[PDB]
Amino acid sequence: EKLGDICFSLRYVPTAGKLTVVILEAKNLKKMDVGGLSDPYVKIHLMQNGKRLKKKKTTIKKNTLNPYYNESFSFEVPFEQIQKVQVVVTVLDYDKTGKNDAIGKVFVGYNSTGAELRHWSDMLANPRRPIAQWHTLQVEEEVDAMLA
């Protein structure tokens, strides 16, 4: 079972030092509780130098593998810092009791790779322009090793 895909936009405003992440949609999500309900939400972490700086999260959508969010989040990242930060995007399954299991995650920014690096580079190259892209979710074990 594939993990699924996440669509989000990035926008950077250098003068104000404002980084905006809009969580748009996820699709094809893996069903986490077999025979149960899939209730996805998205977490965003801002990191620098391997440290978690800020956490935000979306609302929870109920009983879907294809949630639509369209929820915007902004971070204060000055222009002398933006090239060294990471933005981690994780889709999780909400449960009222018990740890919420991650479906998968991706990150953009410093040390990112592939399409995530291209997305981030496009944001940096085009101040003030929102750039939306899809990304394939990856198992947390692998992304977390990159981020540690």
The reply to whether 101 sits in an annotated binding site is yes
Quick check: 38 and 68 in contact, CB under 8 A?
Answer: no
Bridge-based pairing of strands 18-27 and 68-76 is: antiparallel
Alpha-carbon distance 121 to 88, whole Å?
Answer: 16
- What is the structure's resolution, reported in angstroms to one decimal? 1.3
Q: Report the CATH number at residue 114.
A: 2.60.40.150
Phi (first) and psi of residue 138, to 5 degrees: -125, 150
Q: How far apart are CA 23 and CA 102, in angstroms?
A: 16
Q: Residue 8: which of 69, 53, 96 has the closest Cα? A: 69
Element (H, E) at 145: helix 140-147
Judge whether 95 is annotated as a binding position. yes
Token output for 87:
């933005």
Q: Identify the residue whose tokens are 């449960």.
A: 95
- The answer to whether the annotation marks 122 as part of a ligand binding site is no
Q: Rounded to whole angstroms, how far apart are CA atoms 7 and 63?
A: 19
Q: Which domain holds residue 7?
A: 1-148
Q: Please, which experimental method was used?
A: X-ray
Domain count, the chain: 1
